[PDB]
Coordinates of C-alpha atoms and ligand atoms in Angstrom, one line a residue:
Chain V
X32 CA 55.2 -66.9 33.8
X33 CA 52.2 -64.9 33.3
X34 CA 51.4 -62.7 30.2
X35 CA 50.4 -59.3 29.5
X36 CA 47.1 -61.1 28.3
X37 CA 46.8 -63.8 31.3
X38 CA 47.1 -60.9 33.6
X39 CA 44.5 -58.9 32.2
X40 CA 41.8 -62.1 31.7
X41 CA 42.7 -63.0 35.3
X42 CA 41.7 -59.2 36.4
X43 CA 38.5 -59.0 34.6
X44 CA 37.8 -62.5 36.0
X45 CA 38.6 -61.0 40.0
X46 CA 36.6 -58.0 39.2
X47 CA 33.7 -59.4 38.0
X48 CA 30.8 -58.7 40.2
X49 CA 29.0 -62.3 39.3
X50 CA 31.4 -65.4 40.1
X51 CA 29.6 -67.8 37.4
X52 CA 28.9 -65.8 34.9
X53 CA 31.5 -62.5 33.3
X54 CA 29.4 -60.0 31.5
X55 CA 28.7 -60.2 27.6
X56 CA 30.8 -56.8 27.2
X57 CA 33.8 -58.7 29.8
X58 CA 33.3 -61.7 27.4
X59 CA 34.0 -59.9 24.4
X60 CA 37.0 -58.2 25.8
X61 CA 38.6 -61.2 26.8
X62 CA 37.3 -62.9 23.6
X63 CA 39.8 -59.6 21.5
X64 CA 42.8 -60.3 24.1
X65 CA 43.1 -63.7 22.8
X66 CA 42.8 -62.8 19.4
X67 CA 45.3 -60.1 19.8
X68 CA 47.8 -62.3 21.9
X69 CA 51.2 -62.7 20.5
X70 CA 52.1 -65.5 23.2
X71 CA 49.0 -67.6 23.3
X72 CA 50.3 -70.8 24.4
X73 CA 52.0 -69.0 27.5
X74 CA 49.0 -67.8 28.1
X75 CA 47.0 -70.6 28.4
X76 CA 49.9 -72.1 30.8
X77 CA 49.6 -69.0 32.7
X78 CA 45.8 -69.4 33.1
X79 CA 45.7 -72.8 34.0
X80 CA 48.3 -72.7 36.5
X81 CA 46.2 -70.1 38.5
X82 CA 43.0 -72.1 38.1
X83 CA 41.7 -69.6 36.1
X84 CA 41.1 -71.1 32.2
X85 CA 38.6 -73.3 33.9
X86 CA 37.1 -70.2 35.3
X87 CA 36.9 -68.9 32.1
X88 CA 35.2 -71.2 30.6
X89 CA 32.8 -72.0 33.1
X90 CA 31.5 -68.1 33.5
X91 CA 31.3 -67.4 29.3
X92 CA 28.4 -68.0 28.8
X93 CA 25.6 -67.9 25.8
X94 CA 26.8 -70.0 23.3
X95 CA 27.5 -67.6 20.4
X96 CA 30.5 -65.9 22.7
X97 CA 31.8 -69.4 24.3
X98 CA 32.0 -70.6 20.4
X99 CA 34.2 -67.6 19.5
X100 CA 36.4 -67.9 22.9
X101 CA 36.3 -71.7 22.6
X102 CA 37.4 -71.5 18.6
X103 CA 39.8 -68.3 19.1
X104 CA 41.9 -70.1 21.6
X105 CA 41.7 -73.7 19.8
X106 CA 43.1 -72.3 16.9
X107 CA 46.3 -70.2 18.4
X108 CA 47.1 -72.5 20.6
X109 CA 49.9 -75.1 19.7
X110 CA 52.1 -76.9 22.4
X111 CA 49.4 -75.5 25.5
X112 CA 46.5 -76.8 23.1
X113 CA 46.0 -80.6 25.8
X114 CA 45.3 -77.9 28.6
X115 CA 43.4 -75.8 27.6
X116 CA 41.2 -78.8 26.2
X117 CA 41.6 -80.7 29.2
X118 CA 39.9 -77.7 31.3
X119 CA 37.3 -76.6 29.1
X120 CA 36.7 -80.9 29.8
X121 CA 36.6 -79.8 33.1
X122 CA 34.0 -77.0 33.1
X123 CA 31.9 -78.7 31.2
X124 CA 30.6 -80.6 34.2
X125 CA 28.2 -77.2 35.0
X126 CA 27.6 -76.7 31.2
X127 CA 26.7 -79.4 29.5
X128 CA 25.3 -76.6 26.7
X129 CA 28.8 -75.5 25.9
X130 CA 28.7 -74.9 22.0
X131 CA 26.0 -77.4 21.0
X132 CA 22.8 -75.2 19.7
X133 CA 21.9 -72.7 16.9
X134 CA 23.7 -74.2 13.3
X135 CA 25.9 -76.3 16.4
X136 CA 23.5 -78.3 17.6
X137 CA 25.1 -81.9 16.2
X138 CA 28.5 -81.0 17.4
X139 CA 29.3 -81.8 21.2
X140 CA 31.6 -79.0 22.5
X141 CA 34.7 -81.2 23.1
X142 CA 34.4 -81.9 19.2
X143 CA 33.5 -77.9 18.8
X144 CA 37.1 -77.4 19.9
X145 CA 38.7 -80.6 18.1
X146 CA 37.2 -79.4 14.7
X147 CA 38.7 -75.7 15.1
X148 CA 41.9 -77.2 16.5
X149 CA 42.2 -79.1 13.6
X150 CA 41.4 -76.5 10.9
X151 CA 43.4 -74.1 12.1
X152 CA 46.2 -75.9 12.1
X153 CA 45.2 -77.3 8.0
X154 CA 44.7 -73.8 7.2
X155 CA 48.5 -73.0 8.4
X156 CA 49.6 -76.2 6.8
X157 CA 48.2 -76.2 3.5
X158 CA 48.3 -72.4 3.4
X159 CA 44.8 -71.3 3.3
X160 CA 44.7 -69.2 7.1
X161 CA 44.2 -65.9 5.1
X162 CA 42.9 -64.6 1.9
X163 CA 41.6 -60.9 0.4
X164 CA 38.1 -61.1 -1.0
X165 CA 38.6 -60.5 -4.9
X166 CA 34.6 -61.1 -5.6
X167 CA 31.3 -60.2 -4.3
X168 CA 28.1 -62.3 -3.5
X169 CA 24.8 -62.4 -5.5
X170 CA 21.9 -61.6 -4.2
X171 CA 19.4 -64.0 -5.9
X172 CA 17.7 -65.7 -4.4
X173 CA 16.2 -68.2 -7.0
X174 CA 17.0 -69.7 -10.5
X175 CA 20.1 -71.3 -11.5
X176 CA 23.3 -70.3 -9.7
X177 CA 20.8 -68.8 -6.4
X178 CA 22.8 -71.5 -4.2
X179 CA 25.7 -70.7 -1.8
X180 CA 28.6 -70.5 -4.6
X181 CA 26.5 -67.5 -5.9
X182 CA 25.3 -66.2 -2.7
X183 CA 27.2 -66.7 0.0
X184 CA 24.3 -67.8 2.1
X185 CA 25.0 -70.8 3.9
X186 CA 22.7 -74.1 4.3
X187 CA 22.6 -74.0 7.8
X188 CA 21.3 -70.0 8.0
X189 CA 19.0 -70.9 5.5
X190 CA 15.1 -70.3 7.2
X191 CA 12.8 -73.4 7.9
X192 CA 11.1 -74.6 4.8
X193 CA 7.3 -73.1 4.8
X194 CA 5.7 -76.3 7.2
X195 CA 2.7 -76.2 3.7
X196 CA 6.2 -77.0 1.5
X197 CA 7.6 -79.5 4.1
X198 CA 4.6 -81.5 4.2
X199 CA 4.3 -81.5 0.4
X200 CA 8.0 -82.5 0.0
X201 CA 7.3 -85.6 2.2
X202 CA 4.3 -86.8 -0.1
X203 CA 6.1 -85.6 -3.4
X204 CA 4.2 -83.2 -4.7
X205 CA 5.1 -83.0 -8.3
X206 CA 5.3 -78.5 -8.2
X207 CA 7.2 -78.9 -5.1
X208 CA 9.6 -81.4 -6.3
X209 CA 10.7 -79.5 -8.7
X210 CA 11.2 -76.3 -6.9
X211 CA 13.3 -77.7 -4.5
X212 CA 15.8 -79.6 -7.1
X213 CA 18.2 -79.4 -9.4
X214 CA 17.4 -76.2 -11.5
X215 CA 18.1 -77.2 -15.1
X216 CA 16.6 -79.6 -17.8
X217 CA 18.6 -78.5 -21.1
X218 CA 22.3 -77.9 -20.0
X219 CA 23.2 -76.5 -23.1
X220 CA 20.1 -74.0 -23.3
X221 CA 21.2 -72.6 -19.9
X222 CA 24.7 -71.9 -21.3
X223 CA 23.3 -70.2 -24.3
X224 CA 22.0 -67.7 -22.6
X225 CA 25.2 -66.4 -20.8
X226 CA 27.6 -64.5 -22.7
X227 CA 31.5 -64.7 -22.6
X228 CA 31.4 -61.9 -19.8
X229 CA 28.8 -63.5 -18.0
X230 CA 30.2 -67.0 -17.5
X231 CA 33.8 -65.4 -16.3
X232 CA 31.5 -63.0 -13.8
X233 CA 29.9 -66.2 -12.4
X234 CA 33.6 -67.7 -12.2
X235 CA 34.8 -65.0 -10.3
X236 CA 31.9 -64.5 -8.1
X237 CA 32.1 -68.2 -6.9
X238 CA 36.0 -68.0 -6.2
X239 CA 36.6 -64.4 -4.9
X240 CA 34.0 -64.3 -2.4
X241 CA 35.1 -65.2 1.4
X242 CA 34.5 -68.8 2.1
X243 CA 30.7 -69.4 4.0
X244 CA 32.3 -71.3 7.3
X245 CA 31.2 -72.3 10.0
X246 CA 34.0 -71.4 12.1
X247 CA 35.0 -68.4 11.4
X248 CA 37.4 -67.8 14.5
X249 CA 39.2 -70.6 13.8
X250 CA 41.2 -68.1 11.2
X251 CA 43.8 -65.9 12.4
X252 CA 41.5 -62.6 11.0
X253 CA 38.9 -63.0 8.4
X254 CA 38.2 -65.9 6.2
X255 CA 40.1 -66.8 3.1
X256 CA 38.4 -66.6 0.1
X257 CA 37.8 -69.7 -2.0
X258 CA 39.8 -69.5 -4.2
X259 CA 42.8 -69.8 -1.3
X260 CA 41.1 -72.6 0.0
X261 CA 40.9 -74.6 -3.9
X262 CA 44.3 -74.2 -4.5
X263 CA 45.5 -75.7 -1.6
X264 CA 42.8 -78.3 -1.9
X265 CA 44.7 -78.4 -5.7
X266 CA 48.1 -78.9 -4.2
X267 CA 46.9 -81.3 -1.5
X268 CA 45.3 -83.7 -4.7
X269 CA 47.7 -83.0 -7.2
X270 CA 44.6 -82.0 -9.0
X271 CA 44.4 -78.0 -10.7
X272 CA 41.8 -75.2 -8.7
X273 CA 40.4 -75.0 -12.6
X274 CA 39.4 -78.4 -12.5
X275 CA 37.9 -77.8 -8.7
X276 CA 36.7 -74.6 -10.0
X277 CA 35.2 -76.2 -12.8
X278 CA 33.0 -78.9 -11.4
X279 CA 31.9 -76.6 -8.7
X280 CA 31.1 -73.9 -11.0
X281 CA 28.9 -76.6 -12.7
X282 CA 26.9 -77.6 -9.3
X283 CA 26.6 -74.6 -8.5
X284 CA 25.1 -73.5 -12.3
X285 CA 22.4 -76.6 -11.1
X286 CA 21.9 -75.4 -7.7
X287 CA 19.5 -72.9 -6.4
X288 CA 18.9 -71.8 -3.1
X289 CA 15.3 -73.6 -2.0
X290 CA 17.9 -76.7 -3.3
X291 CA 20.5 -75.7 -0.6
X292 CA 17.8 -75.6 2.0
X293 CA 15.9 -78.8 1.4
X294 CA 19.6 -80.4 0.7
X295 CA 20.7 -79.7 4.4
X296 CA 17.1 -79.8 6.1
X297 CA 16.6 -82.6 4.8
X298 CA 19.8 -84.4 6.0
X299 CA 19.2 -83.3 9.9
X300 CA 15.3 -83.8 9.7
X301 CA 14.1 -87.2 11.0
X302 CA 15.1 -88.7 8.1
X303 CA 18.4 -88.4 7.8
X304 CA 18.4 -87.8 4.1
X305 CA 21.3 -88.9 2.0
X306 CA 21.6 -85.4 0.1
X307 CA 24.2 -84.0 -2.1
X308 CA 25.1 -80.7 0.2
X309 CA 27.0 -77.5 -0.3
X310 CA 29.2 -76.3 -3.0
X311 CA 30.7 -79.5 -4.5
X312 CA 27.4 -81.1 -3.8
X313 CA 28.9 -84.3 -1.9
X314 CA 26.7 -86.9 -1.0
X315 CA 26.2 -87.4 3.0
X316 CA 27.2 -91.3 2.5
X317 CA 29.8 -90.7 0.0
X318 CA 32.1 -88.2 2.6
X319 CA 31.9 -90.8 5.2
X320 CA 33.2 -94.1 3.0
X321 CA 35.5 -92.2 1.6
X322 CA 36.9 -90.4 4.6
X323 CA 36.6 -87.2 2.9
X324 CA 37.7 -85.0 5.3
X325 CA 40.9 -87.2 5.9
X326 CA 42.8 -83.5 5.2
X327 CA 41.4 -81.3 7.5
X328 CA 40.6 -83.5 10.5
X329 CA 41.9 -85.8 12.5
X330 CA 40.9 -89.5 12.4
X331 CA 39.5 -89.6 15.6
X332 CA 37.8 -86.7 15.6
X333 CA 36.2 -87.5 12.1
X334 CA 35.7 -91.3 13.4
X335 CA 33.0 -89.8 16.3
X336 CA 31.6 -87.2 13.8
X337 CA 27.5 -88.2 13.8
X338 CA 26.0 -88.2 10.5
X339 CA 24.1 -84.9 10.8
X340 CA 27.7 -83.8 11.6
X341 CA 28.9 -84.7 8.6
X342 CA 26.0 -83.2 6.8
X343 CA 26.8 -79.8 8.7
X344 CA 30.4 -79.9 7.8
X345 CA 29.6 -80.6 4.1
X346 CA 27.8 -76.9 4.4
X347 CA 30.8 -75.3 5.6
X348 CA 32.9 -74.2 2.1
X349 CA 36.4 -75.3 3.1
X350 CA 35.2 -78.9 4.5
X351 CA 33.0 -79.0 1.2
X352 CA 36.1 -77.7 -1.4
X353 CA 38.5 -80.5 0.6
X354 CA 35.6 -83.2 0.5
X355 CA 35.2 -82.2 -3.8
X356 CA 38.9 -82.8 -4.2
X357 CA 39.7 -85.7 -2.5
X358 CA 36.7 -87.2 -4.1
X359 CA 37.5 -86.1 -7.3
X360 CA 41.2 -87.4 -6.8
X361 CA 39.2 -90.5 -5.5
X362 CA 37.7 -90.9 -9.2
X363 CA 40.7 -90.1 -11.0
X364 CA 42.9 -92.7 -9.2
X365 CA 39.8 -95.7 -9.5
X366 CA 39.5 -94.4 -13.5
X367 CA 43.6 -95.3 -13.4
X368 CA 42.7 -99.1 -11.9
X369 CA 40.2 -99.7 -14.8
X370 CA 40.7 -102.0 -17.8
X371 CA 39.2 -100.0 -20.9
X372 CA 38.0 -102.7 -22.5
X373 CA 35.4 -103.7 -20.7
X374 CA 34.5 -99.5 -20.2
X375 CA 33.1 -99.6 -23.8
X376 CA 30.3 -97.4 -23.8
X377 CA 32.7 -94.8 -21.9
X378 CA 35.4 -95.0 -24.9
X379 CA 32.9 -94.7 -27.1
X380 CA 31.3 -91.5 -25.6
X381 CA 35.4 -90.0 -24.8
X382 CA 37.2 -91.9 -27.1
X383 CA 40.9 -90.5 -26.3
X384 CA 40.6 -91.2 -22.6
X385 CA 43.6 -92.2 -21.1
X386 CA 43.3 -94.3 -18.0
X387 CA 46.4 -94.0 -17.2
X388 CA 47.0 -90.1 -17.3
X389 CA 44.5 -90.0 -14.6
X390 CA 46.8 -91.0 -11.8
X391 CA 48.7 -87.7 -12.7
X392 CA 47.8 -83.8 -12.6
X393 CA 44.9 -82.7 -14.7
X394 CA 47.7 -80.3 -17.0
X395 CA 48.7 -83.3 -18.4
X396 CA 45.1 -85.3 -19.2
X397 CA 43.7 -85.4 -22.4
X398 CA 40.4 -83.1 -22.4
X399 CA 38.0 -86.6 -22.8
X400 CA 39.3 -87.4 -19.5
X401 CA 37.8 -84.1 -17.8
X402 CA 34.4 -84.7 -19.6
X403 CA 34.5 -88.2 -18.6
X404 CA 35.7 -87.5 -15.0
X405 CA 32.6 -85.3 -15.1
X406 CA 30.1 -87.6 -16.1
X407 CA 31.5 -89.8 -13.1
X408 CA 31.5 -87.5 -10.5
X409 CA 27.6 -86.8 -11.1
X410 CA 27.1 -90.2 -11.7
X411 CA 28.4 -93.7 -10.1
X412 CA 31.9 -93.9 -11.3
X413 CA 33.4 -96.3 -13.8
X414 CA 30.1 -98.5 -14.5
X415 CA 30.2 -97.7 -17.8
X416 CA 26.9 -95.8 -17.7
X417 CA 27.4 -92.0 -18.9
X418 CA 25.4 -88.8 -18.1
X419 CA 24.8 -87.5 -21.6
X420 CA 24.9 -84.0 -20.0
X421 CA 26.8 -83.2 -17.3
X422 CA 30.8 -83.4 -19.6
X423 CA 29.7 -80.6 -22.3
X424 CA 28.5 -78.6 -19.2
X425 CA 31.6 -79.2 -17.0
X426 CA 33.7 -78.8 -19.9
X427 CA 32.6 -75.3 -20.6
X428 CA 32.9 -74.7 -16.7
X429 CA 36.4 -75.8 -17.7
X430 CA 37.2 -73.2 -20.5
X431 CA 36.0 -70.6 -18.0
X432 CA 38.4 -71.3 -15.5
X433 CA 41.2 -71.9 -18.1
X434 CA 40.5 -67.8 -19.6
X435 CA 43.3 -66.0 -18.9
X436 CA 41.1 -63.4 -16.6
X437 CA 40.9 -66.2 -14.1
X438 CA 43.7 -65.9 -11.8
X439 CA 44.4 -68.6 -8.6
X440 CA 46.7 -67.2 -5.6
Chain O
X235 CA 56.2 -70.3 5.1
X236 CA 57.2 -72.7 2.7
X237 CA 57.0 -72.5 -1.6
X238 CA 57.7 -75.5 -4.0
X239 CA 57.6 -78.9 -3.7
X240 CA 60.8 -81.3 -4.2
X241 CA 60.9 -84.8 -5.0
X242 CA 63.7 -86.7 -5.0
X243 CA 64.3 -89.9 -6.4
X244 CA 64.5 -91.8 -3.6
X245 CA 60.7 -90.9 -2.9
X246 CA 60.9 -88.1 -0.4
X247 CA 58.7 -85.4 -1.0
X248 CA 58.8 -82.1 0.7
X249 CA 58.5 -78.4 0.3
X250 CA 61.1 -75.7 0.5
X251 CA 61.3 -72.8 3.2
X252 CA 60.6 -70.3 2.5
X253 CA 63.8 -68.0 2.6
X254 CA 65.9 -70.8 2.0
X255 CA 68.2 -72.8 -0.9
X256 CA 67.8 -75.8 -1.1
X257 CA 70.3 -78.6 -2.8
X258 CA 69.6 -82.4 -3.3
X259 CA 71.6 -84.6 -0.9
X260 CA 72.7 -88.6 -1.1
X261 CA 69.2 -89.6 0.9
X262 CA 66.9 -85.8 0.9
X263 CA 67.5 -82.4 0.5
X264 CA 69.5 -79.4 2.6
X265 CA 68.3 -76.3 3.5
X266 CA 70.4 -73.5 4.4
X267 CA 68.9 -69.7 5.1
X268 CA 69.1 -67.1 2.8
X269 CA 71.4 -64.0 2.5
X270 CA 74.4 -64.1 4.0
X271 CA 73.5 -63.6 7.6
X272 CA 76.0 -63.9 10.8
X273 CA 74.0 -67.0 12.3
X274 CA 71.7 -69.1 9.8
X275 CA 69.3 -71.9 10.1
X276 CA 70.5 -75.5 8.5
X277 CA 67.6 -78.0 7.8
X278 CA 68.3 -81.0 6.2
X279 CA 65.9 -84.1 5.6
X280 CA 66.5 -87.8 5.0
X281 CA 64.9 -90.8 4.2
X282 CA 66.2 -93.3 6.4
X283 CA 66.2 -96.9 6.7
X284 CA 67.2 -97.7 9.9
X285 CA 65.3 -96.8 13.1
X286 CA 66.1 -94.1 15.5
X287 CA 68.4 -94.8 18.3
X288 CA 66.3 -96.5 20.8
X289 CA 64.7 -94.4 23.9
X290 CA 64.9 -91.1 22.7
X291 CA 62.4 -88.3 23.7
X292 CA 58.8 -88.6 22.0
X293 CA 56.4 -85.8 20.6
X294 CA 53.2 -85.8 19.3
X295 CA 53.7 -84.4 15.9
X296 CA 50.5 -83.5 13.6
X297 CA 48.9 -86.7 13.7
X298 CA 51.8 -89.2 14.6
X299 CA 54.8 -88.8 16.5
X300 CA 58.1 -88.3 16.6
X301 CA 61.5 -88.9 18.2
X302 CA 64.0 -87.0 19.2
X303 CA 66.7 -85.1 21.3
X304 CA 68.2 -81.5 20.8
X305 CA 71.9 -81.5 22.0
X306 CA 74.5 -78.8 22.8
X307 CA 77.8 -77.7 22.2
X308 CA 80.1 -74.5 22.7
X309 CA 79.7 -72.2 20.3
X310 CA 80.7 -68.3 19.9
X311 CA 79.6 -65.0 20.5
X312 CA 76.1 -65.6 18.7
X313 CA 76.0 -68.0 21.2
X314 CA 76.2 -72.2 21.7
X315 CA 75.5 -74.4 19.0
X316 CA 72.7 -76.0 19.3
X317 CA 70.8 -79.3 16.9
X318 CA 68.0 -80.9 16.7
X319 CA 67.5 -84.6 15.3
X320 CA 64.1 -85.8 15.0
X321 CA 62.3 -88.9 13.0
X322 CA 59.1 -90.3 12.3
X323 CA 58.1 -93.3 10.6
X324 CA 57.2 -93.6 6.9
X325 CA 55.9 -97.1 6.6
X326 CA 58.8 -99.5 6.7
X327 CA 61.1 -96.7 6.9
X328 CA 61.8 -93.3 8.3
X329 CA 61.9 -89.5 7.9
X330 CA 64.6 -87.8 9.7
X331 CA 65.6 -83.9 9.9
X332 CA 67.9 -82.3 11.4
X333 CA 68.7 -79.0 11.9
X334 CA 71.0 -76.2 13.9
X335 CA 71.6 -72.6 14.4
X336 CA 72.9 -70.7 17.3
X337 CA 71.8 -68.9 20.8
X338 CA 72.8 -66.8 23.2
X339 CA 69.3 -67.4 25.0
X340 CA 68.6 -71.1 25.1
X341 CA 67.3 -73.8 23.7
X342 CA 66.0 -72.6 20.2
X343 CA 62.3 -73.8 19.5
X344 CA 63.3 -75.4 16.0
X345 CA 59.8 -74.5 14.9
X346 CA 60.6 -74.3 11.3
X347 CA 62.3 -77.8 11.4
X348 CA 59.5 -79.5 13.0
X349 CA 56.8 -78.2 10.2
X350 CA 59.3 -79.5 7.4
X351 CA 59.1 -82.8 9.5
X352 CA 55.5 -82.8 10.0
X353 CA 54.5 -82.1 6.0
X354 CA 57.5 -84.6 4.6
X355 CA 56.4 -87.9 3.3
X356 CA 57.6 -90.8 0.9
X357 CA 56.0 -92.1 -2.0
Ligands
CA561 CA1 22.0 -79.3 -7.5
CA562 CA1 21.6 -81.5 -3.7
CA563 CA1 28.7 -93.5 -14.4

């Protein structure tokens, strides 16, 4: 039976003067029906029946408005979900554009709509589909904590790196180096300088701002904020959002946003650099062996993801929060497998470690096995070779997150 | 939609409904709605060693599938009785839920049944 909303698509569709193309007003009306639609799987039925989902995907046309129809129907649609796939298959014979340009380009269309499908129905799942902002961006735009945690500014919008700074990159000029890395040298120094306010501000900047995705109508209304997405990411890992909190917080503290540009540029340029990317800074390599998105996506879908997909998805926040904790999961299980005796230098430097506490959740370790944990998360884990840095710095992350202004929903 | 997780000591792991009590059962946990209202849902879910009965319906269910049949029976006037059993596999074994409430309009969708199905596991 048709709907309310199939009849109306299927009259702006027979009205419209043009038969391959609706008009970007007629687009955007169809595109708020949808979104408004309390029956969308009827609808769909409704619209393939007639012939006219095909229709509707053949005549919506620039990109920006066929991702936000293609997203807002993958992402309320449930049992109708293999139709309205199927014909978007179908028109895709006339378009082989669909969805793939702009921040898009390394994501065919049919895996546009898989990807949106799929989150959607995490988001439900795990119970991150909505969220009220509680914090607002920064606006710097250099120095420590200038990188999308602060901001809000994702990778992908980022603009081209200056083609004099590219070049210079390439040949590794030293000045240039450095202003596209990691912004700190003495850890300590940096959190000298922020008072008790200061360090909770950062905190609840990085959490209570709306995550940066990059599929933003895959949500039932506007985006969750971060903090929604880390403690589901928290329940999913049996971890604690202070811990995620914690060693994002720290990344981000080391992350500026010329980093977040050359981080992703340099991942989809020719060279298909293995960067650490986004807000948990996650190696490209690293979320592919370890199936990092296993939570959010299905396996086939992530099985035909290209590598400069991956890279993409590691910019959006919720893919990157996910990625973070399961990897961070991923090193608490390993540290569990590992015989202490032959981790010397690592009970030396955290010397009430408990291997075995790390298989449970973080409320129960003993703090050396957060600083430890932290050392091998920046570096390989479990080699017994230590960053002499990176625990102090996580662990004050840690007390941050642990003040009692810091509140998780 | 749903609140805390359970764990029983058999292995199965789920979360409560929201809305609903839950008690621990011989092999899983029993849901039944809250209040006291004329016609409430009943979820329950098991962990099951034997297999479903053989050629029942199938589903795609999240990532796996599932089988199952939804039978019916006279009821009153809230309408027939209606319940759903439904399993998937958990390795070597099974998770099974079943659930029932009435309707005067037919066959109930048994959404809430088929999301505790979906997010159950074993450990
Ligand atoms: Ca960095
Ligand atoms: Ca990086
Ligand atoms: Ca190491």
């Amino acid at each position: 039976h048709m709907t309310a909303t199939s009849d109306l698509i299927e009259s702006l569709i027979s009205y419209s003067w043009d038969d391959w193309q609706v008009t970007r007003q007629e687009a955007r009306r169809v595109i708020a029906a949808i979104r408004n639609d309390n029956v969308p799987d009827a609808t769909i039925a409704a619209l393939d029946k007639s012939g006219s989902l095909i229709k509707l995907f053949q005549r919506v046309g620039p990109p920006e408005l066929a991702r936000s129809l293609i997203a807002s129907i993958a992402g309320r649609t449930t049992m109708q979900r293999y139709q309205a796939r199927n014909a978007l298959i179908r028109s895709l014979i006339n378009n082989p554009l669909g969805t793939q340009t702009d921040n898009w380009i390394y994501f065919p269309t049919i895996t546009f709509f898989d990807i949106c499908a799929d989150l959607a129905d995490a988001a439900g799942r795990l119970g991150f589909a909505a969220a009220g902002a509680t914090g607002v961006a920064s606006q710097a735009i250099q120095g420590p904590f200038s990188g999308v945690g602060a901001t809000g500014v994702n990778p992908t919008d980022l603009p081209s790196i200056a083609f004099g700074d590219q070049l210079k990159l390439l040949n590794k000029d030293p000045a240039t180096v450095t202003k596209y890395s990691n912004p700190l040298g003495d850890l300590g120094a940096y959190l000298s300088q922020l008072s008790p306010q200061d360090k909770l501000n950062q905190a609840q900047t990085l959490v209570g701002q709306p995550i940066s995705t990059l599929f933003p109508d895959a949500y039932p209304g506007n985006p969750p904020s971060r903090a929604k997405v880390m403690s589901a990411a928290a329940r999913k890992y049996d971890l604690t959002p202070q811990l995620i909190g914690a060693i994002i917080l720290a990344e981000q503290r080391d992350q500026t946003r010329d980093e977040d540009a050359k981080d992703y540029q340099a991942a989809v340029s020719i060279k298909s650099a293995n960067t650490s990317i986004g807000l948990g800074q996650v190696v490209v390599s690293t979320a592919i062996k370890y199936e990092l998105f296993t939570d959010l996506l299905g396996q086939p879908v992530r099985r035909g993801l290209s590598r400069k997909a991956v890279a993409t998805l590691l910019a959006s926040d919720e893919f990157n929060i996910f990625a973070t904790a399961r990897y961070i999961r991923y090193v608490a299980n390993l540290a569990s497998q590992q015989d202490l005796r032959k981790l010397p230098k690592t009970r030396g430097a955290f010397p009430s470690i408990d291997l075995r506490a790390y298989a449970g959740n973080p409320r129960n370790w003993p703090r050396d096995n957060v600083r430890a944990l932290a050392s091998e998360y920046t570096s390989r884990p479990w080699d017994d070779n230590l960053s002499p840095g990176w625990p102090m710095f996580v662990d004050d992350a840690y007390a941050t997150f642990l003040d009692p202004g810091m509140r998780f929903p | 939609d749903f609140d805390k997780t359970l764990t029983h000591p058999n292995g199965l792991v789920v979360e409560r409904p929201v809305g609903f009590d839950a008690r621990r059962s011989a092999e899983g946990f029993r849901f039944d709605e809250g209040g006291k209202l004329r016609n409430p849902r009943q979820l329950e879910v098991q962990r099951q060693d034997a297999p479903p009965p053989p050629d029942l319906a199938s589903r795609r269910l999240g990532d796996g599938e599932a089988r199952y049949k939804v039978e019916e029976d006279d009821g009153g006037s809230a309408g027939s009785e209606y319940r759903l059993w439904a399993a998937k596999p958990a390795g070597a074994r099974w998770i099974v839920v079943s659930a029932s409430e009435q309707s005067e309009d037919g066959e109930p969708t048994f959404a809430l049944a088929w999301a505790l199905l979906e997010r159950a596991r074993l450990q």
